[PDB]
Amino acid sequence: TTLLNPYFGEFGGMYVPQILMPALNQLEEAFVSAQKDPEFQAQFADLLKNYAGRPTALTKCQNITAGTRTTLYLKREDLLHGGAHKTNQVLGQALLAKRMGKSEIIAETGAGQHGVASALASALLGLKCRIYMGAKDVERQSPNVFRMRLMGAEVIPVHSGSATLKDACNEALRDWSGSYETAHYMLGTAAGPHPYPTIVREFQRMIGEETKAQILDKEGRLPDAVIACVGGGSNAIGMFADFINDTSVGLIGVEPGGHGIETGEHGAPLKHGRVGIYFGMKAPMMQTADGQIEESYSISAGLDFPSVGPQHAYLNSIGRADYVSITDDEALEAFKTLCRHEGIIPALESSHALAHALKMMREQPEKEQLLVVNLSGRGDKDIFTVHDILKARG
């Protein structure tokens, strides 16, 4: 039995080896207790404000929307310590770990941004941190790997499987199954077995809470739509969560379309995958017709999680949120456009959200609409990839 519902409609659950059920039951009880605990909320708020730098700004894009009747705001999670929204929830999870008496952190990472957040949280809070990363991702993300190691974390390359994020995810679970008495698994997205989709959401929902209060203050009204990219779902659900009951507010998640949906080389399982059971949850996934899990493809490393949080699949199924995709080329053009016209270098992940907002504005330039895009990270980590693509063309 659980204190909270493990399912969002048909999606979610706790599909783990039996040995891990006590670790999940322990975590859910600590979370429910922490959420009722004023001293926990004050510690969490203190770290977010005084260490991570919240509240983040809500920036109006006026150059971007000129000539249209779109008003565009960016939620600047790129200005968070670490450069991405990941920092919010690792601070909460790291405090959960200490509330459970744990002294070690296990994390998984693909692009390296969750690894870096986990390492900085562990360093701040006195936790020994070990990070699993697919050997191909380690190869390709040596800066983030060096960042993690400077911050005291052990980076462990995972050669098993495809040697990418899903295989690091597997190894992290394997490790936690034997070490959970002393280690806490700091899952990096709003996916996986219950209670992680719930915990991540609650530890990211200040994004949408701040946005609501900031947008009411600046425009006097709620947004027509908030837009965020969807890798595993944490930044999007963090933005969405406080608007879910504001039924006039559109929720739009943007999965990576990669080279295009019809090419098969994409990372859009919510709309173009098939429900499966993997990584502790029942959720849409990238998988073969055989049920072997595949990788997500995207120009942006961060959108590589081959499935999606079960709360998103649920929100889609009841029609509360809409999910679209954006190809590499659309995201790249959005990247360039923001640099040139607002002086903000976005993460190529968040470039997908922006790309969709630009499409909304450009397709219907006389539609009056107030859009908020969640800028999930800064793009300085991506200039090398963008540079190499530009010189491959011209």
Binding site: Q18, L20, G161, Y278, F279, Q287, D290, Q292, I293
Partner: protein, 256 residues
Amino acid sequence: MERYENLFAQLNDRREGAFVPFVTLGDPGIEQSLKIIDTLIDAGADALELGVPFSDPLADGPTIQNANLRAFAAGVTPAQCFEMLALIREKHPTIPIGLLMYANLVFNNGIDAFYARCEQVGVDSVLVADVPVEESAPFRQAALRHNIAPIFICPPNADDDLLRQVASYGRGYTYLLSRSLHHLIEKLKEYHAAPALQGFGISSPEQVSAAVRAGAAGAISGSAIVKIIEKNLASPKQMLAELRSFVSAMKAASRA
């Protein structure tokens, strides 16, 4: 219809514990896999636990991770695995055949359809490695509707509510992962659970004898077979020979 019950009756008639090797189907290749399993049986395996290669075996150690990669390198698919399961059953009508599955391979073409195919090919039991008893309802229902025994792991950190559930929902045998406090083994007998097979750390004949003495109905060697395969990849015939000698050594140790 009745293979685990029949085996355990006979084993008890002969003052004996079960020895159950695990191996991955199609490792290191389908014909060599078929040769391996026939050797296990001829050497004295009382039942089989068979894994189907899955891309993300998040509950398996490295020896089995490597076994899946060898099978995938051989092009092994679930469909071909079920062709092997049919051929194995048609060669050996009485040996109980259990699958260790991952939930997604069961869920993929429909849960009930998966267990229907198990029944077609003669599978006796299925353990879904990543489905705890709390999530098991749709799986064990489909299992029973198709006369498959749903197998559950009793882990070392098991509390009383779990022992009750494992005893109630499990069939065929209880997969025990423990260091035998046989407190677990006696409470499972107490709750009339399916006979407990000890699956943790069974790599020598001494541990097979030890598990039976603790009260387990037998032992499962989850890795050691696969290790003997991994070490003898260069020579298929020394592989079959060392498999036979290891399995009979292990089987002779269950004769208490």
